[PDB]
Design a binder for these strands. Structure first.
Ligand SMILES: [K+]
Length: 87
DNA sequence: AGATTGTTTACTGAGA
DNA sequence: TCTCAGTAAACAATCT
């Protein structure tokens, strides 16, 4: 068995996150759902996950276009949801 | 206790 | 030359 090389798809981390959220049924995703959507669709991101996931977490917090949404206390779980800022 | 999630600072290189 | 994107890492809050 051998490994194969994929080229990075042409999207910034902001675009990848935005597309992930826009296509989801509730217009909001957890962090791991975002990782999973990106890996499901772009096989380039099935490698170096320690790196690019650090960068996704950084971009979610650093950029004002991403908004954290708390879980309702009646539905507790790991992490919060991420949605797009209403502007 | 350990791992994940989230925030923050500091670089650094791409590109205009 | 200057902005922004992506990397690295420290550290804390909050999960398992
Ligand atoms: K944010």
């Amino acid at each position: 068995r051998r490994s194969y090389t994929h080229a990075k798809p042409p999207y910034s981390y902001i675009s990848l996150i935005t597309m992930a959220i826009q296509q989801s049924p509730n217009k909001m995703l957890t962090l791991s759902e975002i990782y999973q959507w990106i890996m499901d669709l772009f096989p380039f991101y099935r490698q170096n996950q320690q790196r690019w996931q650090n960068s996704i977490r950084h971009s979610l917090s650093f950029n004002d276009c991403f908004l954290k949404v708390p879980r309702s206390p009646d539905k507790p779980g790991k992490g919060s949801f991420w949605t797009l800022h209403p502007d």
